[PDB]
Amino acid sequence: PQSYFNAAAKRQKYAMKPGLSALEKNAVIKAAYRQIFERDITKAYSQSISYLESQVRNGDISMKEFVRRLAKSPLYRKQFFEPFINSRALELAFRHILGRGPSSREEVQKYFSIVSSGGLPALVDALVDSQEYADYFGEETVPYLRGLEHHHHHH
Numbered sequence: 001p002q003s004y005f006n007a008a009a010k011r012q013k014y015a016m017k018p019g020l021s022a023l024e025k026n027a028v029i030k031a032a033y034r035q036i037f038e039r040d041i042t043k044a045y046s047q048s049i050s051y052l053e054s055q056v057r058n059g060d061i062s063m064k065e066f067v068r069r070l071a072k073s074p075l076y077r078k079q080f081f082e083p084f085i086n087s088r089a090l091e092l093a094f095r096h097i098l099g100r101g102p103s104s105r106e107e108v109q110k111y112f113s114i115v116s117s118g119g120l121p122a123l124v125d126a127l128v129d130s131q132e133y134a135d136y137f138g139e140e141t142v143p144y145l146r147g148l149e150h151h152h153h154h155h
Helices: 022-036 048-058 063-071 074-079 086-097 105-117 120-128 131-135
Strands: none
Touching: 022 048, 022 063, 048 063, 063 074, 063 086, 063 120, 074 120, 086 105, 086 120, 105 120
C-alpha cells in the first residue's frame, strides 16, 4: 500500500497486467503452479515449465492458455485420474478450474458425459474455454481458489 496505510491488504490477487516487474511476474507464474498443482513443483519439474515461463513473461501467450496447458498436461491428466475415476476427476477439475464443484444434477451428468467420452483433457477444454467464465472474469486474473478464470478472445 503506497498511500500511507497499514498492511491490511494481505489477500493479494495475481494478475498478468501491463505494469509488472520481473519479481512480480515470477510470483504470478509460480502462484499459478502452486494453485493448479496445489504444491511447490521444482527441480525435477522444469524444462517445459521454464519454457512456458518465458512465453508468459513476454506476454506472448495469454494467462488463460498457460493454465489450460498445465491442466491438460499428462502430469495433471495422470495425477488426478490414475488413482481416481471419471466422477472423481470431475470434482477435482471443477475445483481447480472453476473453483466450484459440480452442484447441479444436470451439471454433474452433463460434464460427466464429457469426462467419460472425451476424457479429462476434454473436460478441461469444456470448463476453461467456457465463455461465461472467460468473458465475465477477465483474462489477466490468476485462477486462485475462489478466484477468477481468464477471458478468451478479445472480441
